[PDB]
């Protein structure tokens with residue numbers, strides 16, 4: 001039961017073009033609120049948080065950004081938040097998708113969400 | 121400008137869970153009309169035909185299901201039809217997506233539509 005995301009890798013800043021119903025149900029963000037955004041909003045603790053939360057690991061975020069910049073897959077884990085602010089550990093897999101011309105047209109995201117017992 | 125498709129590889133018979141705008145524009149089918157269905161409907165001539173049309177290459181259709189069954193990529197070309205029944209040549213690439221526990225959870229479809237000489241028309 002994993003979250004599934006698609007970004008457009010040609011448009012700047014990997015805008016989301018699809019999220020599955022698991023993403024929606026687990027994160028509390030409905031598709032209409034998310035398509036056209038970069039996924040990094042999940043690192044903010046709910047919609048009033050304008051900044052990445054100090055508990056999401058900036059070393060993992062750096063590594064994601066590098067894997068995307070380099071056109072390679074990523075696998076790791078970082079803290080995300082539901083729309084209502086509850087914390088969620090996200091075991092994230094990114095997979096670049098090739099259209100034809102040896103170019104990356106899309107990136108697929110797989111999210112395996114893990115409940116966390118932390119007090120914020 | 122490719123069509124882009126996602127299916128659920130865990131649910132039975134690869135129901136479509138996403139198509140992009142290019143798919144909609146080129147095939148003439150809106151997302152609402154195709155979600156939850158297998159893509160094979162594009163091998164039928166228009167929305168009211170239930171079985172794959174004879175001019176569709178059954179050898180290629182066979183190789184597509186083989187690739188899906190084996191969980192490997194597919195690349196190839198086949199005849200499809202728009203919602204208005206006009207023929208399409210679809211250069212299709214399929215890519216399985218591995219979720220957790222080394223399992224395929226989804227398949228991605230890239231459609232590059234190319235011109236055919238195929239013409240059934242009046």
Ligand SMILES: Cc1cc2nc3c(=O)[nH]c(=O)nc-3n(C[C@H](O)[C@H](O)[C@H](O)COP(=O)(O)O)c2cc1C
Nearest residue numbers: 005007014038039040042043061064065107108109
């Ligand atoms: C397909 C895809 C899925 C992503 N899914 C998530 C996610 O579920 N949670 C998250 O925190 N970041 C996710 N990201 C990462 C952010 O979009 C962004 O790449 C990351 O924060 C690094 O960039 P930045 O330093 O500019 O924020 C995803 C990225 C892509 C391309």
Ligand SMILES: Cc1cc2nc3c(=O)[nH]c(=O)nc-3n(C[C@H](O)[C@H](O)[C@H](O)COP(=O)(O)O)c2cc1C
Nearest residue numbers: 125127134158159160162163181184185227228229
């Ligand atoms: C992700 C994905 C995208 C597909 N896209 C198309 C398509 O655009 N056109 C088409 O004729 N078949 C497409 N198919 C194939 C059909 O769904 C079906 O797998 C094919 O006809 C072989 O299976 P069948 O003999 O049971 O019909 C796609 C399949 C998958 C998994």
